Design a protein around this motif. Structure first.
Motif, PDB file in Angstrom:
ATOM      1  N   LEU A  75      34.143  45.417  28.362  1.00 44.52           N
ATOM      2  CA  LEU A  75      33.293  45.473  27.179  1.00 44.52           C
ATOM      3  C   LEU A  75      32.139  44.480  27.290  1.00 44.52           C
ATOM      4  CD1 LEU A  75      33.430  47.146  24.527  1.00 44.52           C
ATOM      5  CD2 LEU A  75      35.413  47.319  26.040  1.00 44.52           C
ATOM      6  N   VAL A  76      32.433  43.296  27.816  1.00 46.92           N
ATOM      7  CA  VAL A  76      31.419  42.260  27.981  1.00 46.92           C
ATOM      8  C   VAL A  76      30.301  42.728  28.905  1.00 46.92           C
ATOM      9  CG1 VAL A  76      30.936  40.042  29.066  1.00 46.92           C
ATOM     10  CG2 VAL A  76      32.868  40.264  27.486  1.00 46.92           C
ATOM     11  N   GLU A  77      30.680  43.232  30.076  1.00 47.31           N
ATOM     12  CA  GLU A  77      29.707  43.714  31.049  1.00 47.31           C
ATOM     13  C   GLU A  77      29.293  45.149  30.739  1.00 47.31           C
ATOM     14  OE1 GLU A  77      32.009  42.391  34.841  1.00 47.31           O
ATOM     15  OE2 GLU A  77      29.932  41.718  35.091  1.00 47.31           O
ATOM     16  N   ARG A  78      29.818  45.688  29.643  1.00 46.37           N
ATOM     17  CA  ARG A  78      29.505  47.052  29.236  1.00 46.37           C
ATOM     18  C   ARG A  78      28.046  47.167  28.800  1.00 46.37           C
ATOM     19  NH1 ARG A  78      31.686  50.907  30.788  1.00 46.37           N
ATOM     20  NH2 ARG A  78      32.046  49.348  32.432  1.00 46.37           N
ATOM     21  N   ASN A  83      26.617  53.349  20.098  1.00 46.69           N
ATOM     22  CA  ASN A  83      27.988  53.158  19.639  1.00 46.69           C
ATOM     23  C   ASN A  83      28.985  53.674  20.671  1.00 46.69           C
ATOM     24  OD1 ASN A  83      26.038  53.902  17.284  1.00 46.69           O
ATOM     25  ND2 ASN A  83      27.606  52.610  16.326  1.00 46.69           N
ATOM     26  N   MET A  84      29.200  52.890  21.722  1.00 47.20           N
ATOM     27  CA  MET A  84      30.131  53.267  22.780  1.00 47.20           C
ATOM     28  C   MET A  84      31.572  53.017  22.350  1.00 47.20           C
ATOM     29  SD  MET A  84      31.763  52.214  26.020  1.00 47.20           S
ATOM     30  CE  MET A  84      33.155  53.149  25.391  1.00 47.20           C
ATOM     31  N   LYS A 116      30.229  55.604  27.759  1.00 52.26           N
ATOM     32  CA  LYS A 116      31.294  56.228  26.983  1.00 52.26           C
ATOM     33  C   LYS A 116      31.873  57.432  27.721  1.00 52.26           C
ATOM     34  CE  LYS A 116      30.086  60.426  25.926  1.00 52.26           C
ATOM     35  NZ  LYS A 116      30.324  61.060  24.600  1.00 52.26           N
ATOM     36  N   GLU A 117      31.009  58.161  28.419  1.00 54.47           N
ATOM     37  CA  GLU A 117      31.435  59.338  29.169  1.00 54.47           C
ATOM     38  C   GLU A 117      32.712  59.050  29.953  1.00 54.47           C
ATOM     39  OE1 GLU A 117      30.998  62.386  31.475  1.00 54.47           O
ATOM     40  OE2 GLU A 117      31.218  63.033  29.386  1.00 54.47           O
ATOM     41  N   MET A 118      32.629  58.101  30.881  1.00 51.09           N
ATOM     42  CA  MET A 118      33.777  57.730  31.699  1.00 51.09           C
ATOM     43  C   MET A 118      34.704  56.786  30.939  1.00 51.09           C
ATOM     44  SD  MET A 118      30.668  57.270  33.797  1.00 51.09           S
ATOM     45  CE  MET A 118      30.315  57.225  35.552  1.00 51.09           C
ATOM     46  N   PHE A 119      34.128  55.737  30.361  1.00 51.73           N
ATOM     47  CA  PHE A 119      34.902  54.759  29.606  1.00 51.73           C
ATOM     48  C   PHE A 119      35.742  55.443  28.531  1.00 51.73           C
ATOM     49  CE2 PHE A 119      35.169  50.181  29.518  1.00 51.73           C
ATOM     50  CZ  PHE A 119      35.825  49.918  28.331  1.00 51.73           C
ATOM     51  N   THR A 120      35.071  56.130  27.612  1.00 53.66           N
ATOM     52  CA  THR A 120      35.754  56.829  26.531  1.00 53.66           C
ATOM     53  C   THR A 120      36.782  57.813  27.075  1.00 53.66           C
ATOM     54  OG1 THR A 120      33.627  56.757  25.344  1.00 53.66           O
ATOM     55  CG2 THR A 120      35.418  58.026  24.337  1.00 53.66           C
ATOM     56  N   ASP A 121      36.382  58.585  28.079  1.00 53.72           N
ATOM     57  CA  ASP A 121      37.271  59.567  28.689  1.00 53.72           C
ATOM     58  C   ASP A 121      38.620  58.941  29.029  1.00 53.72           C
ATOM     59  OD1 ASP A 121      35.453  61.650  28.532  1.00 53.72           O
ATOM     60  OD2 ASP A 121      35.763  62.257  30.621  1.00 53.72           O
ATOM     61  N   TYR A 122      38.583  57.755  29.623  1.00 53.86           N
ATOM     62  CA  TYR A 122      39.802  57.051  30.004  1.00 53.86           C
ATOM     63  C   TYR A 122      40.436  56.368  28.796  1.00 53.86           C
ATOM     64  CZ  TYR A 122      39.954  57.533  35.081  1.00 53.86           C
ATOM     65  OH  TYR A 122      40.099  58.019  36.360  1.00 53.86           O
ATOM     66  N   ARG A 123      39.669  55.499  28.146  1.00 54.24           N
ATOM     67  CA  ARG A 123      40.154  54.777  26.975  1.00 54.24           C
ATOM     68  C   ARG A 123      40.763  55.739  25.958  1.00 54.24           C
ATOM     69  NH1 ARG A 123      42.253  51.705  24.184  1.00 54.24           N
ATOM     70  NH2 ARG A 123      43.246  51.384  26.229  1.00 54.24           N
TER      71      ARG A 123
END
Length: 130
Positions: A75-78, A83-84, A116-123
């Motif tokens: 999240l820090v380096e995000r 609104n991700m 969010k595409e990849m991040f959200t997909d996993y998260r």
């Protein structure tokens, strides 16, 4: 790290609270700012971590510390922009002061679209997207 499952509740209510709202806020950060702020004030005005039995204390701290740590650096380096993920707000202190609104404004160069595409997909898929 080598596990994956859900459980506990009565022991750490605040945990389950942020957890659920976290999977939902994944689409909206502001939502977390309000919810989180509520649990924060209530919790801080009640008790803190290190609660539960003698086994839950460590198991909880370790687990939370593991995810929080990983998500923290991510999240820090995000710094996606749009609104991700509200995880940042509940991660450090409160990103409400600057969320997708201003973030995406300038960071628009790469909104959460990709992040969010990849991040959200996993998260999301991890928390139980559906």
């Amino acid at each position: 790290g080598h596990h994956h499952h859900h459980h506990l509740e009565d022991a750490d209510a605040e945990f389950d609270i942020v957890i659920g709202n976290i999977e939902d806020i994944i689409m909206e950060d502001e939502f977390q700012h309000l919810q989180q702020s509520f649990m924060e004030k209530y919790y801080l005005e009640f008790d803190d971590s290190e609660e539960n039995k003698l086994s839950y204390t460590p198991i909880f701290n370790e687990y939370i510390e593991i995810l929080e740590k990983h998500l923290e650096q991510q999240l820090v380096e995000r710094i996606p922009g749009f609104n991700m993920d509200a995880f940042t707000h509940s991660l450090k202190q409160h990103k409400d002061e600057v969320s997708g609104d201003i973030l995406d404004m300038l960071l628009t160069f790469t909104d959460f679209m990709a992040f969010k595409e990849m991040f959200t997909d996993y998260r999301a898929e991890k928390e139980g997207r559906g």
